[PDB]
Structures are given as structure tokens and as C-alpha cells.
Amino acid sequence: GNDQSLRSSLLGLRQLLRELPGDEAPLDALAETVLALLAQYGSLRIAGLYRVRYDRTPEPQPLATLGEMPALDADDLLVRTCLERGELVSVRQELLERGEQRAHSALQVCVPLVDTDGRILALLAVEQMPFFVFNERTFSLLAILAGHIADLLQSDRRALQLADIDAQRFSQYLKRSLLDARDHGLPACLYAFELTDARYGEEVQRLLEGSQRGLDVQLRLRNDEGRRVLLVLLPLTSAEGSQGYLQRLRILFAERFGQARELESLGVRIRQYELDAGNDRQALGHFLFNECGLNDQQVA
Template structure:
């Protein structure tokens, strides 16, 4: 396989655009809001300040003889809101107004150079302050968004774990497989996307699994377009096929709410005249709707909150697997034995690094060959932080534990090493150095995940 296929190509911006569009993007920093509105504020606020100054104090619009030059509030506000370049633009407008007022007959006298220089420096300081803190806010928002995703994912997993234990106690005799087997099967179905170019890989198996756990008798799984309407690319049936009415009230309600809908809803407009029992969208963690599950027949007593929650969770787990498989596909194409969870988290952390500049750490622990080294690796893998993702590799030259520490710097890495060292001293009577465990630390900041893991594996294999 060509290794270059997994490396994203650089995107060249700014070509084939009109000159006025490039001027607006240069004057208005990226991420400061709508480009047109920001550009209008950059020009309008200083002009408004000048108009008010000329109206309130026509003999001295620049407030040279006052205790404070109120006219400069316009450029200062622009610099605080958008940064140094828009602030300079506003300052240039005020400076140009000096000559304009002179042409209008206002007796301004000689050009006060120190006056303009002092306020220009003030505007630049405000702009640099704004630029610094907007960058910090963007990084904090990126980290917060990632942490919220992780919290939602962990909450999802916790609920699945509790529900699986309840179902295992109730249905152990009647059902041949457990919830754990179902989740493993769903992940395997979603992982087929890397090997087969399918919109909904394993759709028939997914329907059979959903029927087994949710007692569905007749249903259809339809791939949808960006508007949530069936596009006809993939259709899987459970039971005999039936007609799908895209304008059905329950389907329209589920598409509009982007959530599961059923005939027991209290909203009469959603269930009026519908011929279906349940309609459930398949939406991944990015909010993209991938498919619709339309249920036409299921037992009356199965239509309860627990069954609907189970259905929603199974479909969400499958959709999240599709998203994870697509994001991790370039890395797994180069390293086929890399677990899906590890590859997905590496790719997501690289995206966070590119978007916000926050790096992550990859720590490699090398153990001695033999059963003792493998047993010690398995024990240390169980004492990781809940935020960390591990990959256990067993080679002829020894066992290796790769730990990805999201959003971790040097302090977090040292804390991780100290925690492992304390655990070894408590359970083995010796620390990292005494037990012969080799430690390597790599930061996920400049090298792409696939290349970084290839380098780590190459060093380990002695190539």
C-alpha cells in the first residue's frame, strides 16, 4: 500500500478569489466572527467616533486640549475586539481624518506627532492583548470541547455497562449472547468500512442484532442524504420488504428533532396518520445523520422506555463506530494491527493539535521478554488513567505498552512516570529503573500519528 495515500495534502487558500475578499480576510482575523460584519465594524466604529467627536466638539474634534482624547475609543474598541491589524486600520482612519477636517476648515494647527504616536502605541498594545487572549480562549474552547466529548462518551459507556448487567441477569437463559458480545459485534460491523467501501457496512447483521435485543419483527434500515431523506444507496430489510413513505409524519418528526420518535409520543402532530411504530436516526458523534431505522412491526409490550433506550444506544454505538473507523482508517492502513480505539484517539488528538496547538504525549514502556514481562505489562495497563488509551504489543524482543495521554504536557508525563514507579515499589519492591523497564516519551506535536507510530515501531524492531 502506498504510504503517501495516508498523508493529508496541504490545502492552498487564497487562490481564485477576488482581491476584495482577500482584503477583508486580511483585515479581519479568522474566527473573529462573520467576515462582512467584522469588516464593517472595523471601518464603521472609528468613523462613528469621528462623526460624534465632530458633532460634539467641532472646534477640537481630536480633543487635543481636553483631558482625554475620546475620539480614539473607536480604534481602541476595534483593536480589543479583533486584534492589532484591524486596530491599525481604525487608527489609519483617525489619522486620515486629521487632514480631512483640515480641508473642511477646522483650525487644527500643526500635526501633533507625539499625540498620534502615543495613541497608536496604545491601540497596538490593546490589539496584542486581544490577539493573545483570543488565542488562549480558542485553545481552551478546543480542549473543553474535547473533554465534553470524552465525558459524553464515558457516560454513554457507563450506561451501557449498567444496562448490560441488568439484561444479563434477566435474559441470561433465554438469550445466547451477552451485551458485551453485542457491542463487540457492532464494533466489528463498523470496522468493516476500512475493508469494504460500504455506506452502511453489515446493515443486515445490524438489523438481526437489533431484532434480537429489541424484539423488532419488521423494519428497514435506509441510508440518507444531508437532508435526512433516503437516498436509495443502501436498504436493508428485516422481515418482508414494505413501502417507505418519506413524507410520513413520524419520519418527518424524527428527522426534524434528529432523535428517536415512536407512536407513544404525546405530540399528536408527530403521530397523526403514521403507519410506523418507531423511527430512529443513526447520528454519529459529529451530529451527522447517516441512516434511518424505520420499524413497522414489533410486539406491543416491547414498546417501553427500556427497549427504546436500548435501541437508541445500539444504533448510536454503531454510528460512532462508523465515524471512528473513518477517522482511524489512514493510520490503520499503515499499521494494520493497531486497535481501533487507539488509532481513533491518535487521529483525534492530532486534529486537536492542528486546530488549537495543544499537544499530547505518547509514552512507551518496554518490558523484558517472557511471561513475567507480559504479566507486568497487563497489570500496568489496568492502572492507567481513564482518559488514557493504551496499546499492548507483544513481540519476540519483549512486551511493549504504548500509552496515549491526551492533552498531556511534560508535567503530566512526569506524574505518570511517578505513579508507575510508586505502583512498582508497592507491588514489586523496586522502581522503574530497578526493574529494567525502559521508558520513551514522544510528543504528538510535529509528526503525524502514522509516521510517529511507524518511527516508534521501527526503533523497537531495530530497523
């Protein structure tokens, strides 16, 4: 619902990124797009996007602006606090209620774009947004969006990392889904498909791999019982979405194989794990290693 809008925005951004020449710095090239996306989700009126250097200081000249963005500062406390802390920070509501923003010449909120490593890539500095959005629901969707954007921009150093790009993407997406769940209660779903019948194993895996679509990420593995397992993560997906995912998958299996066969008749054992906040912090381990028969060398 809300989840598909977010996913759609992120898929749009990933597409632009993928089409980018290659001599072009993604943060420079797509800055206006990133600012527009942030503006749309936070109903922002006046804002700026700034590059953040390797020492957590911002470059004063904006990559992009929205509305009548002022020049920055000299050492604005909100700007400093945000980059220091690597977290979103806001002024107190009462400053806005008093009308004290023009005098005091202050911002309203600062949002850092931090990847799954805790690397700060960019700063969103908001001068103006409507009072009715100056709240925790909005601040939270900005933080969610800023993190996923930062992860997508992280589109280098995998040209310097040793792992298959597919394993690298699954690992990053999983960590991010864990943060989305722990920090904001956003849902995601992991499906594990264990292929127990070696006659159909090959073609089932091919069908499953071929089904991959927008943001879903997969990892091909062998478990401790000798059997192929295909792990599928559905980021930013509610229960209605992840249940719908399997319904589509069953239709696909029916096209390919018997309409008179169910997936399970092909030796497919399905296991599912909904990521949560109230979840056990060790329960994902039991799912992955034990239930799925995997190990911490294959999933980390």
C-alpha cells in the same frame, strides 16, 4: 451483566467491520447485520434500515428489512420528525391500544443512527414491535445501540485525520461514554496509572499496554510532574466489571513481577473515575487535569 451482552454485540460488529474488503461501503456491506442487532435488542418484528443522505433525507430503497416491511411513504411525519430532530421518536401508546396502526397506515418508532459529531448516517424505521417492549427502557437501549453502531461505521476520515488512530479512538469512545452516562445513565470507568518509579516504568507500561482487550482504549501520556501516565477507558462497564478489570490486572502483574510484590511497589499510583449522570459536569476535569496532572491538549 446487560453491559457485557451489549459490549459483546459491538465487539462482534467491530470484528466484521475490520475484516471488510476495503472497496465496500460498511453501511451497505453490514446492513443486514446492523438491522439484526437492532431487532434483537428491541424485540422488533417488522422493520427497515435506510441510508441517510448528507442533507438529512432518507433513501427510500431499504438497505435491509425484517419481516414483512412495507415500502416507505411520501413524507411520513414520524420519519420527517426523527431526521429533523436527530432523535428517536415514537407514536403514542394509545394508537396501538386502539388498534389504529393498520388504518392511518403508520409506523411505531423511528431511530436515527447518529455519530459523536451529530452526523446522521442511517435511519431505523420500525413498523412492528410487541406492545410489551413499546416503552422507555427499550427505546433507550435502541438509542444507545444506534449511537455506538454509527460511531463504528464512522470508520473513514481517520484516513483523512491527522491524529494517531489510537488517540482518535480514545477520544471518540470517551465522548460516547459521556453521552451514554449523561443521556442514559450507563456506566463507564476511567483508570489512570501514574508510573512514579523510572526503574520499572518501561516494563510496567509494556505490561499495561499488552493487557488491552475488547473495547478498552488507552492513551499514553506525560503529566506535569515528569511521569508516564497510562489512561484506560472501560466503556459500557459496571462497577462489578471495572473492579474485576483491576483484579485481572493484579493477577497479570503477579505473573510478570513478584507474586511477593503489589502493583504499587513498582511505583504505580492508581486513580479511578466512574462516569455518572449525577456527577459534576466539571469533576472529570479535576480528575484529568489537576489530579492526574494532564491538560486539555492531551485529552479533549
